[PDB]
Design a protein around this ligand. Structure first.
Ligand code: SAH
Ligand code: SAH
Lengths: 329, 329
């Protein structure tokens, strides 16, 4: 069928999504807006090949991203203007192959192996798994944090944080949630554990915010014994990026760190199809893990020797969240 | 702007084009049509991971390729039925990562390096350049030839082949054009040169067609001295996949092989934007070369010590062709 074939071919297009990411990485639209509109001028500005750049811009013009106001000279359309570095959509940074999201999206090249094995393929491409790479590379981690900002009031209200004297945030970088908890709970002291590079950036952030007397930052690995005990151990959007066997290892380390009467608190994603499926596929291919159902959290808790003693949610940012309270059996 | 942002994000989608290729490679829709419709049944049939397959099919359902008639059981939509192996669109084979086109399309992962260097990136990924890989791998070469079939009457009529006693087809696999020329020219004998693996497949084809007394097949490299002299040396859709420096090397070998009075004959692509640009981008990234203008062919001929003594075209299959006659100066 002609309509079906044309639809499938449009849906199969790898050239345009790659062309957009290369253009973003080259700051192509910024150069065009500055008057470097020929392939030769763009080659001088970027270091790339003039003939190949001409062919790239021909393609982006055919896709409606650019126009050709003079022979051999390109300029952004209204659509292409979204790739300007200062555009409020930040689409240039979402697509930039030298920032964390564009870099990670290239791992979809390895989708066949992700589907064969069920394992993420970012480490296969880059030599370190995703969170470790962003920790060890200040530029990558900071770029991810900047994009993902675009007040933690709901989780601060959803739990009585004034009853917790010592709080340990496991995988807590960049420290926004723990900072909000402690500003609402004067009697609480915090410890934040994350990988060493991410922890160092968080330590600098906390000091610049005047919270270094309220929060100790520790660089380390949450698959290892945790560095302190605590009355509440917080896992905020951490377990969702791990398999059930790995999440059980993390929960075990957290349960071992509980003081008498202590609790583990999960802040997690709550349990249109296309948007949610793209997020799920990013989890399969490079972020790790999956979004669990309420039943799956109960099963995970039981396998960790934990009772679910409370759930508060949905907490309503495009996605909703849930706060879970877990206690040792 | 909301409309622009939504358009750019749709255009940026790498998940769906990769999901389609993985599904094609797994023969997923064929398995569903055979009743293996759960992730567990599909894992048994394919060897892939059941949980990852479930997430793949969720995505393809969200994209309109599949539906979920029973909980946990998927089936193709009318769109998805195009991925059945026996569908006349052959879209499963166009997308199959174990056939030549899907395998090559993954090289668009390396578009950044193609744009930086101007060089194709297939050899970087697979260890051999495209035509060499298809020559050395009978399955890949045969899959490409089968897809690209979907009578050579125009080029046979466009030149007086009855005046050529000895014809050499340089890069002539799979041999269709030379076979058509010789069936129209009783006084002509042919020699066909291609890489050894492609030449062996062509030799078998020619023998099965009863043309082995009319055509000698030689395995070799057209950057080397050619194996025979000839009255007409034919380059049919060969020079377009090479840079000007490489095309000049090939033209030099061809000019050296001309008998007195001999001619070189080019059958080439003639000089909607989106379709042609995708073809151009495939040339940049893995096929090699570019489509030249009439002016560029004249410049190439002059740099090779050749006069253009005739052009016959356009010859009208979606694309048009041109026949060029070249003579030593
Ligand atoms: N093995 C490990 N040990 C400690 N932290 C880890 C880790 N693997 C991943 N992480 C950290 O897990 C965090 C997940 S994203 C940050 C979640 C944060 N608690 C929030 O609410 O937003 C990252 O900061 C990452 O560096
Ligand atoms: N170095 C080389 N030496 C000989 N043949 C080569 C070669 N590099 C590529 N080729 C061959 O060039 C051909 C280009 S496609 C085949 C073109 C054919 N003449 C036609 O009309 O359809 C392929 O068969 C490929 O194997």
């Amino acid at each position: 069928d002609r309509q079906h074939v044309d639809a499938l071919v449009r849906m199969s297009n790898l050239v345009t999504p790659m062309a957009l990411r290369v253009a973003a990485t080259l700051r192509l639209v910024d150069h065009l807006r500055a008057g470097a509109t020929s392939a030769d001028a763009l080659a001088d500005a970027t270091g790339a090949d003039a003939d190949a750049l001409a062919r790239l811009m021909r393609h982006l013009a055919a896709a409606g991203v650019l126009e050709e106001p003079e022979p051999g000279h390109y300029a952004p359309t209204g659509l292409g203007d979204l790739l300007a570095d200062d555009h409020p959509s930040r689409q240039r940074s979402w697509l930039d192959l030298d920032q964390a999201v564009g870099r990670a999206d290239l791992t979809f090249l390895g989708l066949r192996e992700a589907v064969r094995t069920g394992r993420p393929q970012y480490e296969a491409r880059y030599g370190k798994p995703f969170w470790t790479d962003l920790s060890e590379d200040d530029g990558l981690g900071a770029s991810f944090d900047a994009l993902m900002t675009t007040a933690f009031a709901a989780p601060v209200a959803a739990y009585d944080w004034t009853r917790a004297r010592h709080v340990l945030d496991v995988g807590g970088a960049p420290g926004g949630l723990l900072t909000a908890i402690l500003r609402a709970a004067p009697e609480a002291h915090g410890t934040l554990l994350d990988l060493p590079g991410a922890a160092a950036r968080t330590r600098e952030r906390i000091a610049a915010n005047g919270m270094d007397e309220r929060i100790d930052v520790v660089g380390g690995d949450f698959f290892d014994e945790l560095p302190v005990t605590a009355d509440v151990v917080v896992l905020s959007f951490t377990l969702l990026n791990w398999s059930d066997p790995d999440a059980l290892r993390i929960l075990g380390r957290c349960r071992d760190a509980l003081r008498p009467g202590g609790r583990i608190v999960l802040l997690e994603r709550a349990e249109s199809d296309l948007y949610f499926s793209v997020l799920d596929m990013r989890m399969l291919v490079f972020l790790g893990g999956r979004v669990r159902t309420d039943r799956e959290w109960a099963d995970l808790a039981a396998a960790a020797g934990l009772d679910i003693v409370g759930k508060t949610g949905p907490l309503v940012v495009p996605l909703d969240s849930c706060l879970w309270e877990l206690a040792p059996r």
